[PDB]
C-alpha cells in the first residue's frame, strides 16, 4: 500500500494548502487520516475522482502534527459526491477513512422554473 508516482504532469492549479470552496452545497471533509498522508497526497488522492477545487490539511496545536483530517471541495455537489460514494469508508493501510461534505440545513438551489 501507500503507492505513489512522480509522473511529470502539466497540471498547475494551485490548490494544495487552500481554505477555498466550491458552490453552495458542494463540500468534502476527510477524517481519520494516517501520518504518512499530508497535504498534496489528499489532493492527488481525490484528483482521480475529478478536478478538486480545494484541498488542505489541518495541524494539531499541541503535537504540531496533522490533525488526521483535511478539507476539500469540488466545482459542484454532483462530482463531490462521486468521491464520498467510494472514499467513504476507504480502508487505507490498516484503518478506514471518513469523508463527508459539510452538512447543509437550508439549501436553495435555483433550478428550472416555469417548466
Swiss-Prot record:
GO terms for biological process: embryo development ending in birth or egg hatching; germ cell development; mRNA destabilization; mRNA processing; mRNA splice site recognition; negative regulation of cell population proliferation; negative regulation of gene expression; positive regulation of gene expression. Residues 26-104 form the RRM domain. Phosphorylated. Its phosphorylation status increases in senescent cells. GO terms for cellular component: cytoplasm; cytoplasmic stress granule; membrane; nucleoplasm; nucleus; perinucleolar compartment; ribonucleoprotein complex. Induction: Up-regulated in myotonic dystrophy pathophysiology (DM). Ubiquitous. Keywords: Acetylation, Activator, Cytoplasm, Isopeptide bond, mRNA processing, mRNA splicing, Nucleus, Phosphoprotein, Repeat, RNA-binding, Ubl conjugation. GO terms for molecular function: BRE binding; mRNA 3'-UTR binding; mRNA binding; mRNA regulatory element binding translation repressor activity; pre-mRNA binding; RNA binding. RRM1 and RRM2 domains preferentially target UGU(U/G)-rich mRNA elements. Component of an EIF2 complex at least composed of CELF1/CUGBP1, CALR, CALR3, EIF2S1, EIF2S2, HSP90B1 and HSPA5. Associates with polysomes. Interacts with HNRNPH1; the interaction in RNA-dependent. Interacts with PARN. RNA-binding protein implicated in the regulation of several post-transcriptional events. Involved in pre-mRNA alternative splicing, mRNA translation and stability. Mediates exon inclusion and/or exclusion in pre-mRNA that are subject to tissue-specific and developmentally regulated alternative splicing. Specifically activates exon 5 inclusion of cardiac isoforms of TNNT2 during heart remodeling at the juvenile to adult transition. Belongs to the CELF/BRUNOL family. This is CUGBP Elav-like family member 1. It comes from Homo sapiens. The gene is CELF1.
Amino acid at each position: 500500500g501507500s503507492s505513489g508516482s512522480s509522473g511529470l504532469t502539466q497540471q498547475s492549479i494551485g490548490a494544495a494548502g487552500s481554505q477555498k470552496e466550491g458552490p453552495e452545497g458542494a463540500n468534502l471533509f476527510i477524517y481519520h487520516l494516517p501520518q504518512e498522508f499530508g497535504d498534496q497526497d489528499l489532493l492527488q488522492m481525490f484528483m482521480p475522482f475529478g478536478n478538486v477545487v480545494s484541498a488542505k490539511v489541518f495541524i494539531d496545536k499541541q503535537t504540531n502534527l496533522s490533525k488526521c483530517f483535511g478539507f476539500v471541495s469540488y466545482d459542484n455537489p454532483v462530482s463531490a459526491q462521486a468521491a464520498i460514494q467510494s472514499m467513504n469508508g476507504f480502508q487505507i493501510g490498516m484503518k478506514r477513512l471518513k469523508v463527508q461534505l459539510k452538512r447543509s440545513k437550508n439549501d436553495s438551489k435555483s433550478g428550472p422554473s416555469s417548466g
